[PDB]
Amino acid sequence: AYTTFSQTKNDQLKEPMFFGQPVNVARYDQQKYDIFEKLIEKQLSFFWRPEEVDVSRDRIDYQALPEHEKHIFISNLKYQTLLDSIQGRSPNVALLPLISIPELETWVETWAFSETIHSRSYTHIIRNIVNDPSVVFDDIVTNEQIQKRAEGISSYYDELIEMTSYWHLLGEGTHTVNGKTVTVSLRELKKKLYLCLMSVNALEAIRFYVSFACSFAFAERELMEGNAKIIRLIARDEALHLTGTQHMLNLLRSGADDPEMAEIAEECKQECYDLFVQAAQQEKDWADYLFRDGSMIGLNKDILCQYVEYITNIRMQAVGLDLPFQTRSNPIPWINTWL
Amino acid sequence: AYTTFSQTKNDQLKEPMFFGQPVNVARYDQQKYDIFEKLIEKQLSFFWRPEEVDVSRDRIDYQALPEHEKHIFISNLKYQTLLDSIQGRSPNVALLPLISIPELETWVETWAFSETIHSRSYTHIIRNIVNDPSVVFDDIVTNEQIQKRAEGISSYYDELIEMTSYWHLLGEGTHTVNGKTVTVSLRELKKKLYLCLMSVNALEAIRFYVSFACSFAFAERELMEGNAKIIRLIARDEALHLTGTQHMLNLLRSGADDPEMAEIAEECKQECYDLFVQAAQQEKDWADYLFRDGSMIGLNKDILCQYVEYITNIRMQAVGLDLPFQTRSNPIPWINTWL
Numbered sequence: 001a002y003t004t005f006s007q008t009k010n011d012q013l014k015e016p017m018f019f020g021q022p023v024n025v026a027r028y029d030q031q032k033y034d035i036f037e038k039l040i041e042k043q044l045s046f047f048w049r050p051e052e053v054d055v056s057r058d059r060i061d062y063q064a065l066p067e068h069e070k071h072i073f074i075s076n077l078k079y080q081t082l083l084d085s086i087q088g089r090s091p092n093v094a095l096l097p098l099i100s101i102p103e104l105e106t107w108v109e110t111w112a113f114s115e116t117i118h119s120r121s122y123t124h125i126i127r128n129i130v131n132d133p134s135v136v137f138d139d140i141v142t143n144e145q146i147q148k149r150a151e152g153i154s155s156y157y158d159e160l161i162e163m164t165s166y167w168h169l170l171g172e173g174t175h176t177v178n179g180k181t182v183t184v185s186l187r188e189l190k191k192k193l194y195l196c197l198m199s200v201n202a203l204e205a206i207r208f209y210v211s212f213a214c215s216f217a218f219a220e221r222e223l224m225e226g227n228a229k230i231i232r233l234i235a236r237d238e239a240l241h242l243t244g245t246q247h248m249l250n251l252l253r254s255g256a257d258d259p260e261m262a263e264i265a266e267e268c269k270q271e272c273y274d275l276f277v278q279a280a281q282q283e284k285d286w287a288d289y290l291f292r293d294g295s296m297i298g299l300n301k302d303i304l305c306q307y308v309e310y311i312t313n314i315r316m317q318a319v320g321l322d323l324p325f326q327t328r329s330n331p332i333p334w335i336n337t338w339l
Numbered sequence: 340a341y342t343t344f345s346q347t348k349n350d351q352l353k354e355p356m357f358f359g360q361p362v363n364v365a366r367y368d369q370q371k372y373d374i375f376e377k378l379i380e381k382q383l384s385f386f387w388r389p390e391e392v393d394v395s396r397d398r399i400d401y402q403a404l405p406e407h408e409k410h411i412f413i414s415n416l417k418y419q420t421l422l423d424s425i426q427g428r429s430p431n432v433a434l435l436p437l438i439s440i441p442e443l444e445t446w447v448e449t450w451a452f453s454e455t456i457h458s459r460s461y462t463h464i465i466r467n468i469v470n471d472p473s474v475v476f477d478d479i480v481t482n483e484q485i486q487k488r489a490e491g492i493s494s495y496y497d498e499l500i501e502m503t504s505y506w507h508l509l510g511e512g513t514h515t516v517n518g519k520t521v522t523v524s525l526r527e528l529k530k531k532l533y534l535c536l537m538s539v540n541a542l543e544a545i546r547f548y549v550s551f552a553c554s555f556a557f558a559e560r561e562l563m564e565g566n567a568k569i570i571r572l573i574a575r576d577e578a579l580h581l582t583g584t585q586h587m588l589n590l591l592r593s594g595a596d597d598p599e600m601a602e603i604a605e606e607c608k609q610e611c612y613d614l615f616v617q618a619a620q621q622e623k624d625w626a627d628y629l630f631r632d633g634s635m636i637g638l639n640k641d642i643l644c645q646y647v648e649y650i651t652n653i654r655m656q657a658v659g660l661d662l663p664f665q666t667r668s669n670p671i672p673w674i675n676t677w678l
């Protein structure tokens with residue numbers, strides 16, 4: 001069913017965002033949703049290379065950090081690398097096969113490209129602060145606390161792609177596979193898409209900004225400044241990324257794109273809320289691991305958990321969800337200088 | 340079977356290029372094949388925006404062209420747009436799911452990103468030379484001569500992806516689907532990959548350079564100079580693209596990556612040769628359409644067909660194939676100024 005160039009001459013302005021006729025001609029003179037066009041332009045205007053940031057000073061800082069402050073910084077840096085390793089590949093393998101409008105197709109691909117620059121910047125930092133980078137990269141796969149968030153986040157992607165395959169190959173209806181019962185449903189497939197986008201919105205808008213705060217806390221003490229300068233560029237990119245998933249969710253929810261999405265977006269509003277909750281608690285439990293051996297000036301388990309609730313409320317309000325925590329003010333306002 | 344983050348701690352240096360364990364951690368301190376790393380760096384170093392090229396002068400040239408010279412330029416520009424519309428999305432949807440080494444995964448994604456810039460540049464040109472861009476973009480889908488090359492090139496992609504889905508969901512062996520006989524084979528799946536890469540190598544290394552010559556022929560007469568300046572940047576990118584598919588083919592063929600690929604690369608050497616032949620003839624027949632209503636100073640059906648054979652020999656020699664045409668010198672040496 002899927003084609004890398006659909007031969008039908010369709011009006012791309014009336015196609016839905018997802019599950020419509022796959023995009024054939026890539027044109028940029030017209031947009032159904034002009035937000036994705038200007039996200040492309042903003043992201044292109046922000047193009048930066050990791051190597052233009054001097055991280056050479058961060059080796060001295062890192063060796064001077066006490067062992068627990070090393071553990072805080074390295075554990076936070078490894079989580080960032082795991083996160084954008086998944087964000088490097090997943091938007092292309094998962095969203096691209098489903099897009100039916102050209103402006104969104106290009107943004108998803110530009111979005112994923114920006115994540116490879118983020119991934120390369122993490123290598124740049126690691127190479128310049130530790131003696132053996134292999135130890136860092138290998139722990140990312142074999143860290144018990146890291147594998148928890150890793151397999152949960154990827155499942156929203158994998159379940160979408162595996163069901164994408166059943167749909168492109170069979171279509172709707174109940175099918176038989178070696179005697180097994182396979183019932184492919186379009187509503188169930190787009191149910192897995194909406195949830196996936198909700199998960200990715202929490203990843204970029206909530207989980208990553210927890211790490212930014214941890215990275216800038218070192219910057220506030222005038223430590224790991226090369227690292228912080230890079231995170232400043234990552235953060236400015238992340239703002240575009242969460243904005244994109246925000247409009248995608250709101251447009252599908254409003255029924256203007258797909259009216260069938262409106263009913264599905266309400267039917268799964270509970271599990272969307274519950275997803276953001278589990279993500280927030282997972283980040284709280286992560287702070288217990290970060291400060292397992294102690295804390296540092298400007299950041300501890302308590303202060304960070306307040307920033308989790310603070311940012312979680314904001315992001316959930318922008319996607320039309322109810323707030324799960326007390327409406328409180330910013331516990332670390334110094335972070336706004338870096339954003 | 341596919342996962343956006345494989346949880347096994349594997350030595351990414353010993354993984355094959357394709358069909359191995361999917362990449363988990365994205366690291367850039369080490370490379371199995373360092374060619375893909377330096378292709379990433381070169382492509383990043385070439386980053387350019389379509390809008391920094393002044394095409395405003397090309398509207399006057401285009402309106403001054405006689406009707407057949409309009410037809411030559413517009414037909415060539417539409418083919419370029421069709422070509423890079425497919426190259427915008429296909430490398431991500433088709434190759435990325437199969438890559439098992441991080442340096443190749445990122446290059447495929449950077450490669451596809453550069454193609455979106457190419458696609459955006461074609462819109463930039465079209466917007467500035469014609470009154471109604473819709474007529475141009477709509478003909479790309481509904482052009483009898485364009486649909487010929489369109490459905491042929493995409494088939495190498497689509498057949499690979501559709502079989503990718505059967506393999507990730509079932510694995511090797513014979514399966515039953517609603518009573519139908521489905522026999523998934525790993526050798527057959529990687530047979531469709533090698534051929535696909537051969538097709539994409541001809542696309543970028545042979546078909547596109549036929550269009551470059553047509554575009555620079557206007558530049559030689561001092562016409563459509565904004566257009567030509569952009570094609571200069573496209574061409575410099577295309578050289579990296581064909582180089583990447585060249586190493587991918589040679590490495591698989593040599594058996595150093597996958598020894599099983601070596602035997603398959605020889606077993607399908609005939610259909611690889613035949614594929615490059617059909618592509619060359621398709622480009623020749625295209626020149627009959629380009630110069631259907633007449634020719635122009637510096638380029639006609641005869642001269643272009645000589646450049647087809649000339650470039651086809653070179654590209655086939657670099658992928659270890661036999662030469663199908665007479666070994667002759669460059670018929671349009673002025674093109675080297677633009678490359």
Ligand SMILES: [Fe+3]
Binds near residue numbers: 087114115234
């Ligand atoms: Fe990122």
Ligand SMILES: [Fe+3]
Binds near residue numbers: 087115204237238
């Ligand atoms: Fe991001």
Ligand SMILES: [Fe+3]
Binds near residue numbers: 453
């Ligand atoms: Fe291109």
Ligand SMILES: [Fe+3]
Binds near residue numbers: 426543576577
């Ligand atoms: Fe290319």
